[PDB]
Structure formats: C-alpha cells, structure tokens
Amino acid sequence: IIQHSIPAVELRQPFFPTHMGPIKLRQFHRPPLKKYSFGALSQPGPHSVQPLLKHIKKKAKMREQERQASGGGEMFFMRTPQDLTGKDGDLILAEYSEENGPLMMQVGMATKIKNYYKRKPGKDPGAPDCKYGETVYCHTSPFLGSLHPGQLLQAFENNLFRAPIYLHKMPETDFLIIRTRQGYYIRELVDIFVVGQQCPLFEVPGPNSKRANTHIRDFLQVFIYRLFWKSKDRPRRIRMEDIKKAFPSHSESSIRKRLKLCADFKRTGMDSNWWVLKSDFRLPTEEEIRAMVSPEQCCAYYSMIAAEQRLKDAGDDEVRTAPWNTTRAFIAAMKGKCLLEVTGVADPTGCGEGFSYVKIP
Amino acid sequence: RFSVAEHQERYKEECQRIFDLQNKVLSSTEVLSTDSATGRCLKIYRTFRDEEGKEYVRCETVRKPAVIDAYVRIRTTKDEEF
Amino acid sequence: PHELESQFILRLPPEYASTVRRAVQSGHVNLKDRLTIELHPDGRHGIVRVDRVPLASKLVDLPCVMESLKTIDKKTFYKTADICQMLVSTEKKFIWNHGITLPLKNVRKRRFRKTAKKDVEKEVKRLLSTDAEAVSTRWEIIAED
Structure with missing residues (x-):
C-alpha cells in the first residue's frame, strides 16, 4: 500500500548506500555537516541565505496544474531525485524518542499518518479532526495498550514499523536551513511530531543469518x-x-x-x-x-550492521537489546507465540517509561 | 496457582499502563526545568632511539578503564596471532 | 550524480528570531542581504549576521534524530533528510543534552538508556603507533601508586 519514490524502489546509491564503513556506521542516521571542496560554499567567508517562498508556491501551483490536467484525482509526483528536496512541499519534522530505533526509514521512503479513533460508548460526536493523516476507527488497538473511549491517537504507519506520534508546535526561535553546494536556503517550520516507541512490523535479521547473507x-x-x-x-x-x-x-x-x-x-x-x-x-x-530486493529489507540490513558496530565497539543484556532479538520478540508476541516482559533491560528509555521487547514464555 | 489467565492479564494490564504512561509524558506541553573489576590501571614502558645516539625510555600510565580494555584486548589477540 | 541535501536547524535569540521570521514570511530577497552565515574552519563555530549584527554561533549535536518529511496531499509523507545538528546563536560543549520539543528535555540524561561514546578507538590508534615505533615494551596491570 505504501508507494515509495522511484529513487527509493530502484535502490539508488545516494539514498541507499552499498557500503557503510565503521565511522559511517557510528554516524548512522546522524550525518555530520560536511565541508565542500568545490562549489560556492567551499570558498571561506560569509554566505547569504536565500528565502524560498516563491519557489514553494510556484512548485505547488505547478503540481496542482499537473494534477488537474491529469483528471483531478490523486497523483504520484516523486519520480525524480529532485522531487525529494526540502525546497518545496509542506515539510513537517519528526523527532524520535529512542536513541537508536530497531528500524528507521531511509531518504526517499514513504510513510502514512493514521489517526486511530475509538468511538465513545453509544453516541459520539465524531473524530476530533486533525490537520494531517486520514482517520480510521480502531476497535482493536494496533499498539500494545488499548485506546480509551473517545481518544484519538495519531501514528506513523508504513511497512517498517508503526509508532505513536504526537503533534507539537515548533519553538519560536528555530528555522530550517537547507544547505547545498550553491548556497543556504531557509524555511520556517510550524509542525513537529514526537515519535514514541516503535512497534516493529519487519524482522531485522541477525548477523551471519541466512536472511542476512541472502540480502547481501x-x-x-x-x-x-x-x-x-x-x-x-x-x-x-x-x-x-x-x-x-x-x-x-x-x-x-x-x-x-x-x-x-x-x-x-x-x-x-x-x-x-x-x-x-x-x-x-x-x-x-x-x-x-x-x-x-525491497527497500525495507535494505533498512533492516542497515539496522543490523549499525547495531553490529555499536555492540562491537561496546565490547548479554546489550545483546538482548539488539534489534534482531527485539524485532523477533515483538513479531512473535503479535502472533501470540509468546509474551514480553514489559519492564526489563531492552527498555530504550532506561526508566519506567517505554516497553522492552524480549521474549518471556 | 494460575499459569494462564493470571500471566496473560498481568501482561495485558502492564501493557496498557505502560502505554498510558507513554502517551501522557510525550504529549505534555509542560516546561521541564534544565537539570574495572580489579581496580587496576595500565602502565606501559617504551624504548626508543633519539636522533644522533640516545636510548631514552618512556613510562606512560593509562588510568582510563576504557583505553585499557581496548589496548590489552588487542595485545591478547596478538599473543594468539603467533 | 545526486548529493543528499544537508539540513540543520538554526536557533536565534528571540528578538532576532522575530525579525528573521518576519523577513522570511515576507518573502522578498531583502532577507538574503540581511541574513548571512559564516562557518569557521573549526567546524563547530560561526557567526550568524542578522541585519548585519554579528551573533556568536556553535554547531551542536542533537541527542535525538529528526527527519524532514515532505508531502503533497498531507496523507503520505516522504522522508527528505536527517537532521542531527543545530547552529545555536547568542567535544562535550558541542553536544546538546535537550531535544527540540518540549517533552524532550534532559533526554540524554534521563530518557536515554546508558550508551557508549561509539574517541577511545582513536586514542588506541595513537598508542599502537607509538608501540610499533619503539624497540622494547614493558607492561604490568598495576595497583595503587
């Protein structure tokens, strides 16, 4: 159901790297600000940022013309790598609660926002309306807990995980600077979600596994x-x-x-x-x-090799917190094979908040 | 001596309680105020030759248990590489 | 080829943030002259100049990982970049303990499970070179001395 961009389903190297070294596995999903060797920003000195507001509304008007020329329905737009820039479209930000999640999306992949709304007993006014996502009425809670009557919970839903998100307004001081080789560009942000503990839907393979070697x-x-x-x-x-x-x-x-x-x-x-x-x-x-090869298999492989590096750098409790173990534990708990100790050491918070996905009989 | 409904219900309620705790803390807009086993260090003696003719010896002590572990792990591996 | 865009967050003092916000939402190229960014060859130091007024900046590492997500219909969201750095304007100093959102404050200290600096590997590489450039090496695990 999830349709990634054509750079993502074709596994282009800029977005899906073929090889990640040790210093690039330590900086996994935290890419440092690289210095350019050639370009306009490579020359040292002050550099003007450039306001893109005409670019955003010109691109949005152009995409609406494309959609109304194609019959007015919903269209697929992300066909080029230059469609995946931050210079256009309505950007939101998404912050993660855990430091290193078991699964994480690469650049170019799609996700959906689903607003799960349990109706009140008997009469209910209707789902509190939300700016982003589509609403669905969930009798059976997707997550580990169960929704209260009359409680709407937004969530990121894709093939990789499903995780509860919480809309917060941005700070009044923070802007978003997109730097490229040519110059700096500035957007404001107004919406930032906080992503809770992920519920994994894809199993990260183990190291030297059969699925691991098959993916390589x-x-x-x-x-x-x-x-x-x-x-x-x-x-x-x-x-x-x-x-x-x-x-x-x-x-x-x-x-x-x-x-x-x-x-x-x-x-x-x-x-x-x-x-x-x-x-x-x-x-x-x-x-x-x-x-x-599917892009989610590449994300599961990248999670495995990043966790391999982190464990290798840090010299059995840590091994339990490895994503192959936790993903196997959660998916087995969802079929009803086994139960999970919800308080343990696989807890990504380190306090009583959050779950731990390790198998108990 | 329940081995069935008791364990299942206990796990279920801890799951709802944990989930409930997780939703409230995260959606809070409340401002939050800014807030070895052996006890043995490692010492290394190094012998080198200076320009012209000299044989100075350097004794260096590593008091960091992290540097220790990575250092001696490599040394033990080398003791076994030959 | 294609190079992944590098987005970071710029935090300004509140009056200067209000002037920059008004100039961004206005949309003229007048803002381009008013707002400049000079990054020093340290890599973790800068000046942000708002209306030609210099402000001192530090590029810090954020404890969580943010991801910019663009959309065309507000139902499906495509990940565009990963954000991990912030150029706050006014090593251990270049690490930010708090997160951007209000619920995430003191995240590194309280909501993060103990994690290792992976630093130590670079220090071991420095010691190995000195060992290989020596002649005789003497080692003993020690006691209090």
Whole structure:
C-alpha cells in the first residue's frame, strides 16, 4: 500500500548506500555537516541565505496544474531525485524518542499518518479532526495498550514499523536551513511530531543469518544488473573495479560468483578487461529487479550492521537489546507465540517509561 | 496457582499502563526545568632511539578503564596471532 | 550524480528570531542581504549576521534524530533528510543534552538508556603507533601508586 519514490524502489546509491564503513556506521542516521571542496560554499567567508517562498508556491501551483490536467484525482509526483528536496512541499519534522530505533526509514521512503479513533460508548460526536493523516476507527488497538473511549491517537504507519506520534508546535526561535553546494536556503517550520516507541512490523535479521547473507547476495546482484543496464556498449559490458568501489568489503570471489552466470571476462581483443554480458542471457526487466530486493529489507540490513558496530565497539543484556532479538520478540508476541516482559533491560528509555521487547514464555 | 489467565492479564494490564504512561509524558506541553573489576590501571614502558645516539625510555600510565580494555584486548589477540 | 541535501536547524535569540521570521514570511530577497552565515574552519563555530549584527554561533549535536518529511496531499509523507545538528546563536560543549520539543528535555540524561561514546578507538590508534615505533615494551596491570 505504501508507494515509495522511484529513487527509493530502484535502490539508488545516494539514498541507499552499498557500503557503510565503521565511522559511517557510528554516524548512522546522524550525518555530520560536511565541508565542500568545490562549489560556492567551499570558498571561506560569509554566505547569504536565500528565502524560498516563491519557489514553494510556484512548485505547488505547478503540481496542482499537473494534477488537474491529469483528471483531478490523486497523483504520484516523486519520480525524480529532485522531487525529494526540502525546497518545496509542506515539510513537517519528526523527532524520535529512542536513541537508536530497531528500524528507521531511509531518504526517499514513504510513510502514512493514521489517526486511530475509538468511538465513545453509544453516541459520539465524531473524530476530533486533525490537520494531517486520514482517520480510521480502531476497535482493536494496533499498539500494545488499548485506546480509551473517545481518544484519538495519531501514528506513523508504513511497512517498517508503526509508532505513536504526537503533534507539537515548533519553538519560536528555530528555522530550517537547507544547505547545498550553491548556497543556504531557509524555511520556517510550524509542525513537529514526537515519535514514541516503535512497534516493529519487519524482522531485522541477525548477523551471519541466512536472511542476512541472502540480502547481501541479492543486493550485489541488483547492483550488477543495474550497472549492466547503464552500459552503453551493445554487448553490454561492465568493469570489475566499479563493483569493487561499491562493495569494497566483499571478497572478489563473491563478486566473481555473481558475475559467473550472466557475464564472461574478455582478456584479449575487443572488450578486453571487461565483463561482457552473455548473449543468451536475458537481462531482467525493471519490475523483476524491483521484485528482487525491497527497500525495507535494505533498512533492516542497515539496522543490523549499525547495531553490529555499536555492540562491537561496546565490547548479554546489550545483546538482548539488539534489534534482531527485539524485532523477533515483538513479531512473535503479535502472533501470540509468546509474551514480553514489559519492564526489563531492552527498555530504550532506561526508566519506567517505554516497553522492552524480549521474549518471556 | 494460575499459569494462564493470571500471566496473560498481568501482561495485558502492564501493557496498557505502560502505554498510558507513554502517551501522557510525550504529549505534555509542560516546561521541564534544565537539570574495572580489579581496580587496576595500565602502565606501559617504551624504548626508543633519539636522533644522533640516545636510548631514552618512556613510562606512560593509562588510568582510563576504557583505553585499557581496548589496548590489552588487542595485545591478547596478538599473543594468539603467533 | 545526486548529493543528499544537508539540513540543520538554526536557533536565534528571540528578538532576532522575530525579525528573521518576519523577513522570511515576507518573502522578498531583502532577507538574503540581511541574513548571512559564516562557518569557521573549526567546524563547530560561526557567526550568524542578522541585519548585519554579528551573533556568536556553535554547531551542536542533537541527542535525538529528526527527519524532514515532505508531502503533497498531507496523507503520505516522504522522508527528505536527517537532521542531527543545530547552529545555536547568542567535544562535550558541542553536544546538546535537550531535544527540540518540549517533552524532550534532559533526554540524554534521563530518557536515554546508558550508551557508549561509539574517541577511545582513536586514542588506541595513537598508542599502537607509538608501540610499533619503539624497540622494547614493558607492561604490568598495576595497583595503587
């Protein structure tokens, strides 16, 4: 039901990285402010910020013209990477309560806001109306607790998790500066949600698991197919050190295993030192490559390797708080396999607030 | 000696209570006021040669249990790499 | 290629925040001349100049992770960037303990489960280089001395 952007479902590297080193796994979802080497901001000195208000309303008027030219229904707009800029559209902010959640969305992925509203016993006026999201009447509480009669609770709902969100107004002093290579741009923000403890809907694999190694192999295969699609020479041909630049932790035996079927190495003559595509091999279409790896599997893999790094840096309680254990515990509790001790050490708050997702019989 | 409804209901009520606690604290617009096992340190002696001719020795003491653990873990691993 | 945009939050003093807010909601390019940002080669220090009045700035790390989410219909929201830094205007000093929203205050101290600085790895890399550049190394776990 969730439709991510075309950069997200095609697993583009800027948004979905092929390899994350140790210093990039410690700064997972906390990207530092990088210094530019070339560009207008790379030259040291004062730099004017630029107010985008004409850009926002011009883009919104243009998208409304596109929607009314296409029959007036609901449209799909996020088709390019330049659609995912912060320079246009209605931005909200979303703050997280936990430090490191078990699952977290990459850039370019979609989520929905669902307003769960339990009616009052007998007569009820109607859901308190809310600016964002669609309202749904929940007799059966989605979360661990149950809604009170007449209580509306907003929540982020996607394929990765489901988490209760709470709308707060922004501080009166804070603005949002979008810096690029060319200059600074400023928006105001008015809406900021606080996201509670996530209820995971996707199971993060463990390290060295079968699902883990399957995702690594399928991700490498999808990258190899998309490099073959990008090739301009007729017998489509790629170079090995492009793949070695993308996946540098991989042993080259695994890369040659992926290239063994679907390609062959030409040493001499034309196409020398290239891996040309086999003439009998039909390169898979775009929808087959999309059906190979899902973006949520990439987010689960990134959560696993980030938690692997954090545990590795910190020398059994911590192992229980690892997202493969907690996601398995919560999904098993949702099928009714087992129960969870709601007070424990997997508690991301460290106090009595919040749950702990570890299995109890 | 309930092994069924008691455990299930207890878990359910702690879940509602925890959830109730979680919603209230987060939606609060109230302002909040700003607020080793062995007891052994690590000391290392280093021998180096200065320019021209010299043999100075440096004794350096690491009192941080965190630096200790990472240092000696590597040393123990090396003792086993050969 | 495409480079992920880098968004951060700018916090201003309240009177200067009101002037910057009025100039942003006005929408002219007059604001462009009025508001400038100079980031020093420290990386954690700056000047924000509002109406050519210099203010001293520090780029700090935020305890939670925020994410900007854009929308076209206010029902489906697409994540655009991750925010983790704030240029407050007026190391341990460059770490902010509180969160932006009102319920998140003293989050790092109270609502965060004990977590490690991963710092220590860099210190170990510094000690290893000195060991490998030596000749004889003597070690003993010690007692009180």
